[PDB]
Enzyme design. Structure first.
Site, short mmCIF file in Angstrom:
data_model
loop_
_atom_site.label_atom_id
_atom_site.label_comp_id
_atom_site.label_asym_id
_atom_site.label_seq_id
_atom_site.Cartn_x
_atom_site.Cartn_y
_atom_site.Cartn_z
N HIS A 148 26.90 22.78 29.68
CA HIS A 148 27.48 24.10 29.44
C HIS A 148 26.79 25.23 30.21
O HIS A 148 27.13 26.39 30.02
CB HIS A 148 27.44 24.46 27.94
CG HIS A 148 28.23 23.55 27.07
ND1 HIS A 148 29.54 23.81 26.71
CD2 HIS A 148 27.90 22.38 26.46
CE1 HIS A 148 29.98 22.84 25.93
NE2 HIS A 148 29.00 21.96 25.76
N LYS A 152 31.33 39.74 23.97
CA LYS A 152 30.64 38.48 24.31
C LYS A 152 29.16 38.78 24.11
O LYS A 152 28.78 39.95 24.02
CB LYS A 152 30.90 38.07 25.77
CG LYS A 152 30.66 39.22 26.80
CD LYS A 152 31.15 38.90 28.23
CE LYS A 152 32.67 38.73 28.32
NZ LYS A 152 33.06 37.32 28.61
N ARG A 153 28.31 37.76 24.06
CA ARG A 153 26.87 38.01 23.92
C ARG A 153 26.34 38.87 25.08
O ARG A 153 26.84 38.79 26.21
CB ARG A 153 26.09 36.70 23.81
CG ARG A 153 26.34 35.93 22.51
CD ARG A 153 25.68 36.61 21.30
NE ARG A 153 24.22 36.59 21.45
CZ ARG A 153 23.39 35.75 20.82
NH1 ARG A 153 23.84 34.86 19.95
NH2 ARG A 153 22.08 35.83 21.06
N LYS A 200 26.41 38.35 32.46
CA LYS A 200 27.76 38.74 32.05
C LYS A 200 28.11 40.17 32.51
O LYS A 200 29.27 40.57 32.47
CB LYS A 200 27.93 38.60 30.53
CG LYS A 200 27.98 37.13 30.06
CD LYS A 200 27.77 37.01 28.56
CE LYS A 200 27.79 35.55 28.06
NZ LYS A 200 29.16 34.92 28.17
N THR A 226 35.42 31.32 27.16
CA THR A 226 36.54 30.96 26.30
C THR A 226 37.15 32.23 25.71
O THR A 226 38.34 32.25 25.38
CB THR A 226 36.14 30.00 25.17
OG1 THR A 226 35.05 30.56 24.44
CG2 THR A 226 35.75 28.61 25.71
N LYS A 280 41.29 33.54 24.95
CA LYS A 280 41.77 34.21 23.73
C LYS A 280 42.55 35.51 24.05
O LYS A 280 43.60 35.78 23.45
CB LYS A 280 40.60 34.53 22.78
CG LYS A 280 39.72 33.34 22.40
CD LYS A 280 38.47 33.78 21.63
CE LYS A 280 37.46 32.65 21.51
NZ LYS A 280 36.13 33.11 20.91
O1 LIG Z 1 31.49 25.67 27.17
C1 LIG Z 1 31.41 26.63 26.11
C2 LIG Z 1 30.62 27.83 26.62
O2 LIG Z 1 29.23 27.47 26.68
C3 LIG Z 1 28.37 28.58 26.98
N1 LIG Z 1 26.97 28.14 26.81
C4 LIG Z 1 26.19 28.54 25.78
S1 LIG Z 1 26.77 29.65 24.64
N2 LIG Z 1 24.92 28.08 25.67
N3 LIG Z 1 24.49 27.26 26.52
C5 LIG Z 1 23.34 26.71 26.57
C6 LIG Z 1 22.15 26.87 25.69
C7 LIG Z 1 22.20 27.41 24.39
C8 LIG Z 1 21.02 27.53 23.63
C9 LIG Z 1 19.79 27.12 24.16
C10 LIG Z 1 19.73 26.58 25.46
O3 LIG Z 1 18.54 26.18 26.00
C11 LIG Z 1 20.91 26.47 26.20
C12 LIG Z 1 28.68 29.00 28.43
O4 LIG Z 1 27.83 30.07 28.85
C13 LIG Z 1 30.17 29.39 28.54
O5 LIG Z 1 30.56 29.70 29.89
C14 LIG Z 1 31.09 28.30 28.01
O6 LIG Z 1 32.44 28.78 27.93
#
Ligand SMILES: OC[C@H]1O[C@@H](NC(=S)N/N=C\c2cccc(O)c2)[C@H](O)[C@@H](O)[C@@H]1O
Ligand SMILES: OC[C@H]1O[C@@H](NC(=S)N/N=C/c2cccc(O)c2)[C@H](O)[C@@H](O)[C@@H]1O
Ligand SMILES: OC[C@H]1O[C@@H](NC(=S)N/N=C/c2cccc(O)c2)[C@H](O)[C@@H](O)[C@@H]1O
Ligand SMILES: OC[C@H]1O[C@@H](NC(=S)N/N=C\c2cccc(O)c2)[C@H](O)[C@@H](O)[C@@H]1O
Lengths: 810, 810
Positions: free
Chosen positions: A351, A542-543, A548, A650, A654
């Site tokens: 991700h 968004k966060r 971002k 995502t 929406k």
């Molecule tokens: O696929 C779903 C979404 O995932 C998100 N990843 C997120 S919230 N955490 N990732 C990684 C993470 C989260 C917490 C700790 C860490 O070490 C890593 C992406 O940034 C988005 O682009 C994507 O749409």
């Protein structure tokens, strides 16, 4: 009142009314004279949950009898939001409950607002898990979500003096009617200890034990009578734990702290022991549960035919060495066979590509906490690197690049490398992201095992994200094309033949206006803030993260303000710019960005010359229930991450589904959204991935942009000089410094194109009819972005199971 | 099957069956194929609790409408035991539920064993609170029990190698179906801070806040449709508490620790800060709740007409300065008027005379934790001592003796002195105890205010302690005299005219035999220990304390063993000697006494010459549910405390009601028991209070007894030499030393008389017919010892309210 909300029959309404009265009396021990509004919510929740029971028991009985392949979705986050409306929607009970409560003299929408969000996630990754559970149930898969039942979810955000303050999210305080404790499946989890080698293999001894107690939450499919399970583990001390006396009892808290709180980091790795314990806790408990269910069907050859485990990022990566441990140490399988089973069972979804987000655990931590797992990881590494060496003889640098073990100041284990080696499938979450994985960060792995690498573009559930949050839009669509699209979102393409339909155009615009009115009303009632509902609603939620680029949005807002001030009597399209999202508590720059946003609002919103032509609002405490309100109200969706940084997004999907147009870079799923809708129907600007790469080779010099763009220079001078913070002139010095000298995300580089593109947005908005026709073209092509499509692809291409839209009997 | 268990009508049984199936399905989410035994218990508990609801709502509505004087019973302990059977008994549902479950293929008695004890007390004081709640409901008083909802009650006792081990009593692990959370009455409690003096009086500022959340438990009266409330407070942190981020959330545990665990000391004061916080927590939350209810009826003159507060020992003594604080600082009443209200509202019950049990809080603790309360206590002290000085001019030593403040190494506050000064009534718990309070420890106070001092002899509820635990005995009594005695225990006097009735004699003896058989069976099934059911069951069950003289019992047991060994072929009446009870975890001598008991058993139970003529068994984990099993099975009740040390005892009354004869000193309520039954029908031995006093004046010399009693010398030599611990010869050196040189409780002094009296017991037991006739004389005169009598006396002589046996409508 509206058709998609279901039938409100005489027999149903009568029954709901009497069961509501029954729960108020017997369950809540109240009568109507003393009942609190929260009592009424609970009465309704119990009445609705009663309807789940038969379907839940028979779904699970059915899986036991038919013995299909089971899908286990492991995640440290499930961002569920509220459950009441969702359950009513999926059971076709919404109109009936609305009628029944109305006849009892109650407003159901008011009761709905009482429910706490189950905020067990940070943002995109956690919400994806939630949409996935909904789609897996709707597609009739034998699927289980497994995670942790955090006592405290993502913090509640309060804004005080323009600054973020954090408050504990004590979401279980009043009790959770949507869970069922399952004490008979309480399981032991082991920590610390040491490894002994006997004649009969390795033994993990002298461990500390923490109990894992499961709570089950139902996951109803959309009108198919399927109810799947999300099982969340809670940490409990054994009764002889630490057993002067009083202190030993109080010290039970130490063991139970494992499930106490969600780590509030989004896309950032914090190597803390408590987090590692959480990751093992969920993995160890889950794997015992999986094995128990598999044996209650000796021969582990069939294990991958009956079990798939999906790893949601690397957070549950310990599943790989844990499965090996159980198969080798406890079941006594030979290494090679255990490994075969493991690889065929596990699959891994990535991700993120940001280096600071990748999990790299210090060896010394694993050594102390999980000594047997460290040994297993070393053995996996040796056998993997022997394969690399045979495939690429003499390539010594490849060997160090691919190793699971990273040398340096402290040795670390790269968990992403572990997941790739131990999984039969590795996927990214949008086409551009999956390509970046193959070309850059996992290039070596792709060259070794090309067949492992896949794409699975993300999606959102159209139940929560259309029918639930935007019934008005769902209804005007159903009037023309029927109800089938709710579980077959591709049917929305049929709306293309209505792009010239004058009735439809008027209806689409009217639904948006009502949503905006409703949201404008929400803002005054709950926050005493006044906004113009005729303005363009320009929304970025968004966060908060540098990548971002909320900061780029801020620059545009200041540009518009400066232009108004320069020519006060010229017409501009009125805007309400809304920005919301939480910052990780330790992320200083993100906290400064929130303060900047509120500081801009303080100047802009009180300037008499501006009037109601520009308003800047920070949306406090952004969360799933707030997303459900704001997204339907939006005209313009801001999706403006630096190309190559947002894996998918995502929130973007929406907004598309709910009738907002998108201004965005060619990043993550924005690329595929523009492809589906047509680039003419999207507001695309800025550097592509290739342009960012070119700039990096040359070296990014922010000064150049500052020197050549007078409007940009002015903003920077205003920020530096204290225009936005008169009593603390240097408040934003950190921000200016970062922009000028250490901006990893090239904010200035996209500024000119962004502003110009924003001018084109304002131009289109001046022509209501043409704005709405472009909206229709977006909604009509949003079908690809249903998580039903996403899940069907995981099912067929990774898990090896066929989805089914067929009903189970009621 | 048996009459006193109620009717099992067709309509009732049908209804119970369907509601049981409903709960199993909808509440527990199970069907009969997968239901665990614990599921069946919960289904039954929910079915029964449903029957409480209407009566609970209407009882509380009735109090609101009629506005009677309310009674608030404040205690840090409520030793409730199990709730299921008790609720069935009081609602006349027992036979119907037994039938319904039987028809479903379930054994109700097996389901009952699944329920956890609510073990929120240590022994006598806590169990008294519980019997009192039952009697107050049965007598139709508007009464509320207020306490703390401890997460962990009294520890579970395990015996390992003959030693006590403690385990956490995680009684809420599976959820408590008998409580209802009341979140709308959550209240703040203040700690620490400092006092500011303004123009408008004192202000308590800069405090730390902990929330008090109430849980309500129903207390049903016996077949009168009254259901009163026991409200227990749980500690919760506010959401901004300590609000790096993760640690602040984890630190919420510190605030919530207040309600985590019950202090396991019986008759011993431990001056710990956590205990002080518990005492204030219950008082502060309770008083706000009382005041709220009083205002929802400005003029506090009527406060004592509408409110009585009963202090169960000094544990909630802070009610006195807390009430003053609220009335003076918050309501702005003048001191003298506030004081008048306080005294008329509060009453205090004393439960002990042992100096080490009296609460004496260091001033430095109160200074830091409760600075305003310390100021108020100082002011109370000054005004009180001014009254003493006017009454007894020149008596300077009286002034120092009566002061609330004790001078010395550390200054302390004597909480008993505070309670006397601030209460309109002070009572002891048996006639001899109340006399001792007036003659010795509170003599100065009695001379100043004689009218304040009362007696209220303790009692036990005949619902739990006869009908519930001994249905066989209840039935054979009801056959002759009807059912009315269950709520009018004095009616048992009618049984005197059956003392020569041959049918009754046979029935009484048969019921005892069945109870003994059942208990002998329980011992083999749950503990694999073999006992002779034809033996005399000689039982001492109560907390382990030097004053209760389990050691004197041990000496007798060794005497009997030595006599058998000396003359193996002589007849002796066979005995099973059972001793059980928990030791406070920090009380070393009590732990050594348990080890001695088990060590004696190890020798005696495996001596082939002894055979089944003598068996010594330690009853593990003595608690309310175990008392319910063992007491009906007993032949001989050991009540052998040194005269003047046991304030009342209540275990004594339970044995009397259930057909055991008593061997006892003239101590506590034993005196009044012997008076009711006749001294001819009681086995009385040993020093009276006056004899103990004479021995103290002379000086107690244990050596004298050792020198003049050969049988005693032998036992001491056996203990010293290692006869009872071969591998650790000196194990019991602490015990021998204490007996010989520092025995505060004069064990040797009563030894000869005790042994001789025990010979008379064995003699009577040889004549079954005469044994049973004496039993009948005991049961027939046990009426005075109903807690209904006790409560009627509190009501009339302290609280100023009339009891009522009249039914509320169903
Ligand atoms: O696929 C779903 C979404 O995932 C998100 N990843 C997120 S919230 N955490 N990732 C990684 C993470 C989260 C917490 C700790 C860490 O070490 C890593 C992406 O940034 C988005 O682009 C994507 O749409
Ligand atoms: O009422 C609050 C309590 O509820 C309990 N749920 C019970 S008894 N039945 N649920 C049954 C059920 C039935 C259908 C759907 C569903 O989602 C739940 C939970 O086990 C507790 O953790 C929680 O505190
Ligand atoms: O089921 C377990 C849970 O039960 C809840 N009780 C509820 S919802 N109704 N009770 C109603 C009730 C009704 C009558 C009598 C009675 O004693 C209780 C309690 O509030 C929880 O603390 C507990 O964990
Ligand atoms: O009246 C009921 C029973 O009360 C008992 N007191 C008990 S359990 N604790 N007392 C005092 C205590 C308890 C804990 C801490 C402390 O500092 C003191 C008496 O010993 C019995 O004789 C009597 O029958």
């Amino acid at each position: 009142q509206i058709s998609v909300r279901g039938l409100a029959g005489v027999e149903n309404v009568t029954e709901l009314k009497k069961n509501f009265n029954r729960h108020l009396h017997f369950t809540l021990v109240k009568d109507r004279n003393v009942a609190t509004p929260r009592d009424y919510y609970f009465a309704l929740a119990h009445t609705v949950r009663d309807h789940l029971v038969g379907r839940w028991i028979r779904t699970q009985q059915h899986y036991y009898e038919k013995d299909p392949k089971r899908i286990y979705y492991l995640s440290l986050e499930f961002y569920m939001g509220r459950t009441l409306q969702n359950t009513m929607v999926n059971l076709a009970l919404e109109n009936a409950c609305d009628e029944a409560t109305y006849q009892l003299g109650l407003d159901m929408e008011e009761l709905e607002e009482i429910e706490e969000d189950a905020g067990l996630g940070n943002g995109g990754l956690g919400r994806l898990a939630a949409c996935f559970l909904d789609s897996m149930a709707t597609l009739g898969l034998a699927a289980y979500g497994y995670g942790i039942r955090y006592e405290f979810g993502i913090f509640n955000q309060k804004i005080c003096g323009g600054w973020q303050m954090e408050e504990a999210d004590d979401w279980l305080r009043y009790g959770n009617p949507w869970e069922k404790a399952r004490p008979e499946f309480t399981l032991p989890v082991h920590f610390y200890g040491r490894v002994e080698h006997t004649s009969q293999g390795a033994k993990w001894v002298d461990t500390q034990v923490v109990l894992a107690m499961p709570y089950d939450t139902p996951v109803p499919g959309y009108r198919n009578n399927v109810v799947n399970t999300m099982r969340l583990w809670s940490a409990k001390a054994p009764n002889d734990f630490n057993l002067g006396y009083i202190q030993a009892v109080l010290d039970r808290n130490l063991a139970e702290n494992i499930s106490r709180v969600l780590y509030p980091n989004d896309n950032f790795f914090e190597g803390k022991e408590l987090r590692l314990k959480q990751e093992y806790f969920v993995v160890a408990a889950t794997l015992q549960d999986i094995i128990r269910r598999f044996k209650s069907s000796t021969n582990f050859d069939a294990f991958p035919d009956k079990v798939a485990i999906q790893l949601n990022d690397t957070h549950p990566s310990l599943a790989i060495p844990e499965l090996m441990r159980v198969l080798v140490d406890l079941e006594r399988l030979d290494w090679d066979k255990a490994w075969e089973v493991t690889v065929k069972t596990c699959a891994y979804t990535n991700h993120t590509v940001l280096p600071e987000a990748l999990e790299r655990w210090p060896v010394h931590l694993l050594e102390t906490l999980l000594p047997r797992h460290l040994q297993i990881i070393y053995e996996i590494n040796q056998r993997f690197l022997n394969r690399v060496a045979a495939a690429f003889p003499g390539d010594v640098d490849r060997l160090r690049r691919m190793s699971l073990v990273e040398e340096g100041a402290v040795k670390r284990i790269n968990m992403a490398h572990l997941c790739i080696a131990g999984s039969h499938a590795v996927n990214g979450v949008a086409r551009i992201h999956s390509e970046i994985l193959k070309k850059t960060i996992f290039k070596d792995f792709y060259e070794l095992e090309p067949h492992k690498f896949q794409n699975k573009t993300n999606g959102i559930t159209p139940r929560r994200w259309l029918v639930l949050c935007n019934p008005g839009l769902a209804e005007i669509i159903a009037e023309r094309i029927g109800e089938e699209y709710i579980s077959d979102l591709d049917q929305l393409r049929k709306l293309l033949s209505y792009v010239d339909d004058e009735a439809f155009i008027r209806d689409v615009a009217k639904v948006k206006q009502e949503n905006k009115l409703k949201f404008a009303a929400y803002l005054e009632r709950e926050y005493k803030v006044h906004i113009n509902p005729n303005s363009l609603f320009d929304v970025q939620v968004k966060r908060i993260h540098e990548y971002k680029r909320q900061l780029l949005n801020c620059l545009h807002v200041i540009t518009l303000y400066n232009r108004i001030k320069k020519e006060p009597n010229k017409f501009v399209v009125p805007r309400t710019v809304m920005i919301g999202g939480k910052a990780a508590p330790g992320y200083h720059m993100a906290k400064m960005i929130i303060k900047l946003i509120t500081a801009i609002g303080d100047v802009v919103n009180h300037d008499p010359v501006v009037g109601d032509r520009l308003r800047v609002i920070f949306l406090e405490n952004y969360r799933v229930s707030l997303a459900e309100k704001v997204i339907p109200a939006a005209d313009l969706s801001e999706q403006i991450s630096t190309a190559g940084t947002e894996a998918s997004g995502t929130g973007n999907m929406k907004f598309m589904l709910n009738g907002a147009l998108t201004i965005g870079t060619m990043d993550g799923a924005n690329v595929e959204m523009a492809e589906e809708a047509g680039e003419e129907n999207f507001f695309i600007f800025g550097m592509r991935v290739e342009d960012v790469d070119r700039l990096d080779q040359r070296g990014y010099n922010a000064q150049e942009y500052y020197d050549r763009i007078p409007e940009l220079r002015q903003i920077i001078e205003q920020l530096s000089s204290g225009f936005f913070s008169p009593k603390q002139p240097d408040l934003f010095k950190d921000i200016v410094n970062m922009l000028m000298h250490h901006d990893r995300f090239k904010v200035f580089a996209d500024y000119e194109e962004y502003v110009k593109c924003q001018e084109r947005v304002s131009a289109l908005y001046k022509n209501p009819r043409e704005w709405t026709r472009m909206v229709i073209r977006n909604i009509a092509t949003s079908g690809k972005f249903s998580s039903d499509r996403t899940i069907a692809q995981y099912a067929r291409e990774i898990w090896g199971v066929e989805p089914s839209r067929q009903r189970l009997p009621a």
